[PDB]
Design a protein around this ligand. Structure first.
Ligand SMILES: *[C@@H]1O[C@H](CO)[C@@H](O[C@@H]2O[C@H](CO)[C@@H](O[C@@H]3O[C@H](CO)[C@@H](O)[C@H](O)[C@@H]3O)[C@H](O)[C@H]2NC(C)=O)[C@H](O)[C@H]1NC(C)=O
Ligand SMILES: *[C@@H]1O[C@H](CO)[C@@H](O[C@@H]2O[C@H](CO)[C@@H](O)[C@H](O)[C@H]2NC(C)=O)[C@H](O)[C@H]1NC(C)=O
Ligand SMILES: *[C@@H]1O[C@H](CO)[C@@H](O[C@@H]2O[C@H](CO)[C@@H](O)[C@H](O)[C@H]2NC(C)=O)[C@H](O)[C@H]1NC(C)=O
Ligand SMILES: *[C@@H]1O[C@H](CO)[C@@H](O[C@@H]2O[C@H](CO)[C@@H](O)[C@H](O)[C@H]2NC(C)=O)[C@H](O)[C@H]1NC(C)=O
Ligand SMILES: *[C@@H]1O[C@H](CO)[C@@H](O)[C@H](O)[C@H]1NC(C)=O
Ligand SMILES: *[C@@H]1O[C@H](CO)[C@@H](O)[C@H](O)[C@H]1NC(C)=O
Ligand SMILES: *[C@@H]1O[C@H](CO)[C@@H](O)[C@H](O)[C@H]1NC(C)=O
Ligand SMILES: *[C@@H]1O[C@H](CO)[C@@H](O)[C@H](O)[C@H]1NC(C)=O
Ligand SMILES: *[C@@H]1O[C@H](CO)[C@@H](O)[C@H](O)[C@H]1NC(C)=O
Ligand SMILES: *[C@@H]1O[C@H](CO)[C@@H](O)[C@H](O)[C@H]1NC(C)=O
Ligand SMILES: *[C@@H]1O[C@H](CO)[C@@H](O)[C@H](O)[C@H]1NC(C)=O
Ligand SMILES: *[C@@H]1O[C@H](CO)[C@@H](O)[C@H](O)[C@H]1NC(C)=O
Ligand SMILES: *[C@@H]1O[C@H](CO)[C@@H](O)[C@H](O)[C@H]1NC(C)=O
Ligand SMILES: *[C@@H]1O[C@H](CO)[C@@H](O)[C@H](O)[C@H]1NC(C)=O
Ligand SMILES: *[C@@H]1O[C@H](CO)[C@@H](O)[C@H](O)[C@H]1NC(C)=O
Lengths: 236, 368, 372, 174, 49
């Protein structure tokens, strides 16, 4: 169940950790192209699971609007087997249990009519910290919260950017602009080429980044407000 | 329902003349018009210091600046010469009068209205309304911290206005005599009669049609302010000069952040991360790159200054001929037959208001 | 000075430029975070067993205080070649991330661990990048890391299909394919064992003994520094021309206060000229603004050696009130200070009369040798 | 073009073209400025007339002969005989393959001749009046009388010696 | 580029780049100087016209 739509103008993140004001700085880096083809995946097993392993290359833009905690984690790495090294992310209420333990199976849901890391042998770096997925509720469901994430790795380190948007009120990938502040930059030297997502028992977008040249505008408060591509259109 | 359209260039409306053996055409009416000309006179003076630029506050780098002969005793001389000639240009253009004249207290010149160009005592700046519009249509500190200094001109823009006021007050109560000998008084209508007598028209035309001519002059001078204030780009020549100078300075100061085939573009970083004895390798590359990048700037500045001196000379000639007299050269002091001109100041430039005579209504006749 | 800048003993009447001046810094300040935990260096050098050559034991040093003096407890230091940085200044630096690789080799190949070098260890076991920065250390270990019968724990690769890219472990027991026989695990003729062993005995000599080598790799760029030298912190001074060393950002400035609104994840500040403008204090977590130090040229106004020998100075575009550099002792001369638009005029009065101009200065003022 | 010239079609060479600042964003600007001023020069020189005038059908100007300078309709190029001689007295592809391009001017040499024809046809049936206001007709001998009157010679000299002056003009132009 | 490998090829290429940069800057400067003296003649031609 894969649907298709238009990515619009979305997926712009701060490239460097500096402060600039009233500048028209232009930079070349990995970005999500404007008006690209984004695949709207779909799956449900609340009537094992209905999704194979997606490919991973040059990072992923991942956006979702879930209810409370339906979608929690991620699995990265090659072949997802207990012979190579893989990465796990799980987001519960109070902490993040990110780890680089070696495993192949980590889920035994068995919905009636946990079991996490069933085989974890040689663990590695851990970065237990504050949970990522948090929401504030105004006692009304008029505005569905939208969460945007960007995952990439270049020359070491794992870069994870994120942003929350309560502006959405019934549209998928709405018109507008919103940059992403960096959240996690942690060091790991493993090799990643395959990607999969978790889901909690008892909505799902995937993109792809490419090396492009962007031109960004900063305001007097240091926040990016607009950006233009340099290959989409001759006017650009 | 619009789209981009490509066509063939046109040259103008086709016109045919009816030349014959005995057939002449004579005008029966005239029309006084006011044209406008804009001329740059001078750029902005500047100065550059080698030592602070090439080797910022580092004696170790300054020691290696030798063994290159004297490549910085000549850049200073070139920039000083440019600054001196920039100071000389405005002195040549404006200082044409030995004395300073004052506008008469009671202003009544045969019905002509000069209030649009005479100084206005209400504003403390003591400038004409046209000069105010010219002054309102034409990162800075960062360059100051790299050894690039900007020098002020030796005529504040409050005595240049005095020169312009003196010229314009002399030219309305003395005609053209104040440019040759002592100033001699003469009524304005008599001066206009003399000016008409200089383009092959008898003077009795003026004295028989005076109110109409005065009204035409007032209407012509009225709308030039609106045309200047409403044209999207009328003062387009001075802004080009300012933009070119700003772009040159910006691209010169931006060149400091270049590796030039070296590990880093910061003298402090290389001087602290490495010991002296093998540090004189990257520093040489930085010095060479900066020397070339500064020589290019100096050469560009010289070439640009030549073409502005070549325009200041023309502005001085036009001030000497059109203003201090009447010019018989065709299509020099504006289109049509020339009557008089008025100067106005502008940031790094002058604006000439030419008053010209144009025939209006033709009539056929048979001649022998 | 005027007679020296232009070669002559007689200078004509006019105005000349001689040299420049700059305000001088007063005191030095160093600011570092509260981190005090020592680095695990003392463990990595002093260990019991090192790994093989083809599979080195890479380690990453996280944030800690690094003292580059404990390693001197090892006496010999057969080689201490540092490429990217000078060893002497190793203490007064801050790094982003530090990698340490420790292993054991023979003497005859200790010279082979360097950028742009080829061979057997440098090509089949461990290749450094051409733009590598860091240090290498080697010491003798024959006497306490050898056996009478010998040690065969350490093996090194000898045959490989392709050249090793820098920083790429190649742990793989794949039988070499040579000749024309497609071996399927035979491991016989024309199909050799890629790894060959060592034998270490106390009866060998220099160049025939195991030496312990460790290589440290750094990376310097604009990023939050985690490893820093044991330099002591200092106090904060404001509104005074001082030179600062904020966490690797070194330079002169005044360090006033700022009203900027740095985001919680930002550290530095820039401008349109790509120059550092604002900084964040490592300890108090405030924002400071760095404006450079007063500087400018000077000029001499002389009436000519033919007339007299009295001059005046025209410090270009500096306020006399605060910084008139107050060496030829002409500074703030009594009743001889005038603040014009051009700058600080020292040595001349300002009358309220008007004459013709002799020596132009700027913004409209002229100097002359008029008598009383 | 810098890139094709300095480092011909080689990304490896083009990568090293950095670390030299921007030494090729200024050469393009300089050459563009030169080209723009080259386009402006001919516009300034030739475009002195607002309208385009046509030569009269019947050509008889007091006996003067202008056929040597007026356009000749026989040749399709529509040029005077003198222009033909000027056009006949005043490795190329190799430079094209090195990044050096030659641009065409924005006035083909078939409307410049139109400008010259307009100027020369205005100057023989209107004197100098068409440079100031509306064009006014006047016979040619009267115009020559006015021109003689401008160098301190009375006009009666022309009207008493006209055939001789016309013959001298024809011989001089021949 | 074909007879040698990348890692030590960035030595001759630098010399070629430097030589060509100087040889092109000289051409640009000469062109500017020549264009000035032709503008100075176009102005005179316009005045004479
Ligand atoms: C030579 O040209 C001038 C300028 O056009 C002529 O003067 C103008 O003549 C017209 C015709 O009457 C005037 O228009 C009318 O004026 C009355 C005045 O009350 C007004 O009420 C009408 O609405 C209309 O505008 C025009 O005002 C006048 N120009 C000026 C400045 O007074 C002149 O007549 C021409 N010479 C000959 C011999 O025709
Ligand atoms: C002067 O007389 C000539 C000839 O009579 C006029 O030219 C003619 O004008 C009429 C009226 O518009 C046209 O129908 C003819 O075609 C014209 N002849 C030619 C050869 O062009 C001329 O217009 C008159 N002058 C003015 C100012 O009207
Ligand atoms: C000269 O022209 C100026 C501007 O057109 C005249 O000033 C105007 O005068 C009228 C009537 O006195 C006022 O209603 C306007 O408000 C004035 N305009 C301005 C901008 O002041 C001036 O009166 C004219 N001179 C004479 C002698 O009439
Ligand atoms: C104007 O001069 C041209 C060229 O001298 C004359 O054209 C010649 O005319 C004669 C007699 O008609 C011919 O024999 C020649 O062959 C012509 N030469 C050319 C090149 O065509 C023309 O006739 C003269 N105009 C007048 C009115 O006599
Ligand atoms: C995205 O790709 C699919 C598959 O080829 C295609 O049908 C769809 O039109 C594409 N999206 C757009 C906006 O063209
Ligand atoms: C969330 O995970 C942390 C880390 O394992 C654990 O201490 C905590 O009890 C968990 N909370 C819930 C509600 O599962
Ligand atoms: C995991 O660790 C065990 C014991 O620590 C070891 O025997 C095994 O080889 C390791 N797995 C690897 C290296 O893949
Ligand atoms: C990652 O693993 C895949 C599959 O083993 C391999 O094809 C790829 O080259 C590896 N990439 C890196 C950078 O090690
Ligand atoms: C910048 O932040 C201030 C502080 O609240 C706010 O008043 C102002 O509107 C902001 N401006 C912009 C352009 O975001
Ligand atoms: C003009 O004079 C010529 C010369 O005789 C004659 O051929 C022509 O018919 C005349 N035209 C007019 C309109 O008089
Ligand atoms: C080295 O380590 C051993 C044990 O690991 C310890 O007994 C010894 O004191 C240490 N010596 C030094 C100089 O660190
Ligand atoms: C360092 O210690 C001082 C003293 O308590 C404290 O005020 C400051 O916040 C500390 N800073 C950091 C970064 O720990
Ligand atoms: C001033 O200059 C003249 C020039 O020859 C010289 O003769 C004279 O001696 C000079 N004045 C003095 C005091 O030397
Ligand atoms: C000196 O002058 C400058 C600018 O003219 C001014 O900013 C500064 O405050 C002055 N010094 C003092 C002590 O006021
Ligand atoms: C000269 O002018 C200055 C500036 O107005 C004033 O301070 C000073 O008192 C004046 N001196 C005399 C003698 O009038």
């Amino acid at each position: 169940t894969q649907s298709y739509t238009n990515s619009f103008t979305r997926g712009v993140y701060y490239p460097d950790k500096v402060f600039r004001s009233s500048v028209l700085h232009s930079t070349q880096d990995l970005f999500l192209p404007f008006f690209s083809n984004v695949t709207w995946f779909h799956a449900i097993h609340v009537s094992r699971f209905d999704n194979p392993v997606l490919p991973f290359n040059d990072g992923v833009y991942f956006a979702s609007t879930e209810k409370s905690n339906i979608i929690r984690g991620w699995i990265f790495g090659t072949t997802l087997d207990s012979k190579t090294q893989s990465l796990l992310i799980v987001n519960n209420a109070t902490n993040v249990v990110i780890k680089v333990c070696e495993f192949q199976f980590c889920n035994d849901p068995f919905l009636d009519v946990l079991r996490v890391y069933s085989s974890a042998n040689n663990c590695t770096f851990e970065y237990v910290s504050q949970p990522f997925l948090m929401d504030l509720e105004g006692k009304q469901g008029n505005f569905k919260n939208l969460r945007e994430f960007v995952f990439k790795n270049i020359d070491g380190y794992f870069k994870i950017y994120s942003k929350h948007t309560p502006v959405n009120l019934g549209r998928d990938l709405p018109q507008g602009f919103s940059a992403l502040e960096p959240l996690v930059d942690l060091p790991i030297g493993i090799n990643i080429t395959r990607f999969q997502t978790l889901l909690a028992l008892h909505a799902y977008y995937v993109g792809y980044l490419q090396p492009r040249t962007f031109l960004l505008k900063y305001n007097e408060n240091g926040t990016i407000t607009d950006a233009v591509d340099c290959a989409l259109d001759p006017l650009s | 329902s619009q789209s981009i359209i490509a066509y063939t260039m046109s040259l103008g409306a086709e016109n045919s003349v009816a030349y014959s053996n005995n057939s002449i055409a004579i005008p029966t009416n005239f029309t006084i018009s006011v044209t406008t000309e804009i001329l740059p006179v001078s750029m902005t003076k500047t100065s550059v210091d080698c030592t602070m630029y090439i080797c910022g506050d580092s004696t170790e780098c300054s020691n290696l600046l030798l063994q290159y002969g004297s490549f910085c005793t000549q850049l200073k001389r070139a920039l000083t010469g440019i600054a001196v000639e920039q100071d000389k240009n405005t002195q040549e253009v404006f200082a044409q009068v030995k004395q300073i004249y004052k506008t008469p207290p009671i202003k009544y010149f045969g019905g002509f209205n000069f209030s649009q160009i005479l100084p206005d005592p209400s504003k403390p700046s003591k400038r004409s309304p046209i000069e105010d519009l010219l002054f309102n249509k034409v990162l800075i500190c960062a360059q100051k911290f790299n050894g690039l200094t900007v020098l002020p001109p030796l005529l504040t823009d409050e005595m240049i206005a005095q020169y312009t006021s003196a010229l314009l007050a002399g030219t309305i109560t003395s005609g053209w005599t104040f440019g040759a000998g002592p100033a001699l008084q003469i009524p304005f209508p008599m001066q206009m009669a003399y000016r008409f007598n200089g383009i092959g028209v008898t003077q009795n035309v003026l004295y028989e049609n005076q109110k109409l001519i005065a009204n035409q002059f007032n209407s012509a001078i009225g709308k030039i302010q609106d045309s200047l204030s409403s044209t999207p780009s009328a003062l387009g020549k001075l802004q080009d000069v300012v933009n070119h100078n700003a772009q040159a300075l910006n691209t010169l100061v931006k060149q400091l952040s270049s590796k030039f085939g070296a590990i880093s573009s910061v003298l402090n970083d290389i001087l602290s991360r490495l010991d002296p004895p093998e540090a004189e390798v990257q520093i040489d590359r930085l010095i060479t790159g900066r020397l070339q990048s500064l020589q290019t700037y100096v050469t560009q500045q010289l070439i640009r200054a030549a073409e502005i001196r070549a325009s200041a000379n023309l502005a001085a000639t036009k001030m000497s001929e059109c203003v201090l007299g009447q010019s018989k050269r065709v299509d020099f002091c504006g289109k049509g037959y020339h009557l008089m001109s008025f100067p106005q100041s502008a940031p790094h430039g002058v604006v000439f208001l030419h008053v010209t005579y144009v025939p209006a209504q033709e009539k056929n006749f048979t001649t022998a | 000075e005027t007679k020296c800048t232009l070669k002559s003993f007689t200078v004509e009447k006019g105005i000349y430029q001689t040299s420049n001046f700059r305000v001088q810094p007063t005191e030095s300040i160093v600011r570092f975070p509260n981190i005090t935990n020592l680095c695990p260096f003392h463990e990595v050098f002093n260990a019991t067993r090192f790994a093989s050559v083809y599979a080195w034991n890479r380690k990453r040093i996280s944030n800690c205080v690094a003292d580059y003096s404990v390693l001197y407890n090892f006496a010999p230091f057969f080689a201490f070649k540092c490429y990217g940085v000078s060893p002497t200044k190793l203490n007064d630096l801050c790094f982003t991330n530090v990698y340490a690789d420790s292993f054991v080799i023979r003497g005859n190949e200790v010279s082979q661990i360097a950028p742009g070098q080829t061979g057997n260890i440098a090509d089949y076991n461990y290749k450094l990048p051409d733009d590598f920065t860091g240090c290498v250390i080697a010491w003798n270990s024959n006497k306490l890391d050898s056996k009478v019968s010998g040690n065969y724990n350490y093996l090194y690769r000898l045959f490989r299909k392709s050249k090793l890219k820098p920083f790429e472990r190649d742990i793989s027991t794949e039988i070499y394919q040579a000749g024309n026989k497609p071996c399927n695990g035979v491991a016989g003729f024309n199909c050799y064992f890629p790894l060959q062993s060592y034998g270490f005995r106390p009866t060998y000599g220099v160049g025939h003994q195991p030496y312990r080598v460790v290589v440290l790799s750094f990376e310097l760029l604009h990023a939050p520094a985690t490893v820093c030298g044991p330099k002591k912190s200092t106090n904060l001074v404001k509104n005074k021309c001082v030179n600062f060393n904020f966490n690797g950002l070194t330079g002169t400035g005044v360090l006033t206060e700022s009203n900027k609104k740095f985001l919680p994840f930002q550290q530095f500040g820039r401008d349109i000229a790509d120059t550092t403008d604002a900084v964040r204090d490592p300890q108090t977590l405030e924002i400071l603004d760095i404006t450079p130090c007063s500087f400018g040229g000077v000029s001499v106004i002389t009436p000519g050696t033919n007339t007299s020998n009295q001059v005046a100075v025209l410090y270009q575009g500096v306020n006399c009130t605060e910084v008139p550099v107050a060496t030829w002792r002409v500074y703030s001369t009594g009743s001889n200070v005038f603040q014009t638009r051009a700058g600080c005029l020292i040595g001349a009065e300002y009358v309220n009369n008007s004459y013709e101009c002799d020596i132009p200065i700027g913004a409209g003022i002229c100097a002359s040798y008029q008598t009383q």
